[PDB]
Amino acid sequence: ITLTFWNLFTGEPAKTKVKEIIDQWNKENPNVQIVESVTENDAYKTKIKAAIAANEAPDIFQTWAGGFSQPFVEAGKVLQLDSYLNDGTKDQLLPGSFDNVTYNGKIYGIPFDQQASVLYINKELFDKYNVKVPTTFSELIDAIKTFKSKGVTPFALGEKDEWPGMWYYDMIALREGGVQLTRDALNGKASFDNQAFTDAAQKLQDMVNAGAFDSGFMGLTRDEATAEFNQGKAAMYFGGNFDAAAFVSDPSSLVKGKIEAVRFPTIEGGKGDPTEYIGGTVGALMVSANSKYKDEAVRAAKYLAKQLSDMDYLIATGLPAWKYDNIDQSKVDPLEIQIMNNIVANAKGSVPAWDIYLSGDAAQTHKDLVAQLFAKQITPEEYSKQMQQKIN
Template sequence: MKKLISVFLILLFFLSLQGCYKNTENNFSKSQKITLKMWHIWAQRSQDNNSIIIGDIINQWNKNNPNVQIEVESVENEKYKTKLKTAFATNELPDIFYSWGGNFSKPLIDSGKVLAINEYLDNSVMDELNEGMLSNVTYYDKIYGLPLTFSVGTFYINTQLFEEANIKIPDNYDEFLDVVKAFRQKGITPLLVGEQDKWTGTLYYDILALRDGGIEGCKSALSGNDKSNIYLNAANRLKELIDIEAFDESNIRAMRDESEVFFKQGKVAMYFTGNWLTGEIQAETSLIKDKIMVKTFPIMTDGKGNNNEFLGGAVDYLMVSTNSPYKDEAVQAIKFICKNLSKNYYEFGSGLPAWKYDYDETNVNKLSKELRKMTENGKYLLYWDIYLGEEKGNKHKELVYKLFQKKISSEEFAEEMKKLEE
């Protein structure tokens, strides 16, 4: 009997020790310092305002949370896609990473390596977001990221060049073609594109398709049902712009950053790109400050598109790896970063707010405010390279590039696009 009591006491002793160790471990995990590794696309350059803004926000997080530090690595847009793809293949994702929504991220979600964050969010988060901001990052009824900002394809007009050339700003597509020809005759570059980055040219193609077929027509075509010949019509319109020399040959051969300098110097009349440029345009050091207006891309009288349809939407997200040992901390960090970046990017002029903005707008970039008003009733179609996903999106970019290089006919382009859904 005494032997049984001794064994029982020994078991109790070891069980109590195990409990002590467990409690000690839990207490230590709450007080230990951890590092969250984060990747994003805003290259850390001193002259890059977007990089400065996100850097300041992360520094603020690190200051507020001395035990949970964020360590950043950033890579430029296209190189980042390769880096991200490699990390998924080798299972080397950081705790937090940037990704695009829609079909671009779907294969990543299907891999099981991205954390569904529903259970880590309280109801207040949903109340803080603008309507529809999670639609491009919700898969199988689960949320896999939080939005950073809201992107809109934006048509920039250099009003000073129009005034000096005595040319009327176009209100429809026919007038737009006349304007292109008028500026070319005066020796002024009508439109800008840095096509060596390839996605820059797709913006022109995609907006031409949107104006021709409208959102529903484009979605139908992208789903393999191009009954209205949207692919062909948009290719013909882009080919016409190329043939009448809407773009300089030099900036067709240049990267976006190289060619964009000419617009920033006030040497190009019009530019269709994203609203991420408005901050640089209105910066105090900008040569074109207060000389640029934003406008909806011209409507086609024979097209199905309208002024309330835009390229873009919520496409920029932060996600968390399922392999992160600090999931709760990582989700709290992306909420802090996303909400603050949404506000600061809107104020500076790098994007429209994805989160509800209820602050004094005195310091908001005037072009951002104009865009917000212009798009308040807008409907959106994702940029096609994001809508299609990486593989098909890359094929789309290559085909548009061939149009710019005059190495493919409009008919060949349309046939190749149709093959994407076969």
């Protein structure tokens, strides 16, 4: 039997590590082989949605739990997994790992990773100019102005694919409004046309106007921006913890041991708790409802998920969802540990990035309207009117 598996781990060392994880399975399972097809993140979203709709999805596929996957589950395209989870598997994952892969009270995925929002600081550049790490949004705007004045790009941001810049908006909205107001809006219990979301839009444009980003940032991908930051060409980078690898594990990086992870700053008058973050347990593997080899495919998905989780922890491409007592802490990068310590530990609450929590057209609307904010092609007030009108 040969199972197909799709994932998005395109960069090094993840691409090599995933291949190794698959090679090990294949050596230990002569009669159940896996073959993988690997597609860059943003093209993978297109690929997996089309495949699921056309009933040509692989046996096992990587996904984002929550809103992203909800249509696949509602269409009957995803194998329910409850009957395969009475074997002790649950106790091998961290508490609460399954919540986002549970729909209508039933489990449709095997979690493997958690996301968390991280402000990354180039300590070398901060020390060079004697800039303190900013802890408030006022301090952050002052730091942006200080770096800009020295000819140093304050933030490396690649906004072409829209979701990386959206992280900035969703965090600022979380600091302005708090987690409950974000959830209510995303769940349709509050209009998007609310002063906290408009204030967030203004603060995002305050970053642009202060010269936080390089002139051509709308033209750059995430990968191009992580290359900018790992070459030491920007003071700060903000986004997912998954980007950490580009800085401490990518062999091209010039900033290993120079990068610190901190929480996004507080905003004066904001209603959000300073420890709230954008993220949650949202990396999962799912099995296709139409797989010819359901039992083998779930066995393989259990194995893949644990190995991806351990890999994520070791190379800092993600925060593990599986317990990691088998892993030796001295082999883990200090930045990954720091993400756990500075962002995740003792956090009051969290919410996934809005394009994983929303689905389809609504997620796309938010990504495109945020991209207009960055481009100064919309006012904060019209942003919030249009969000309400286009979504609801």
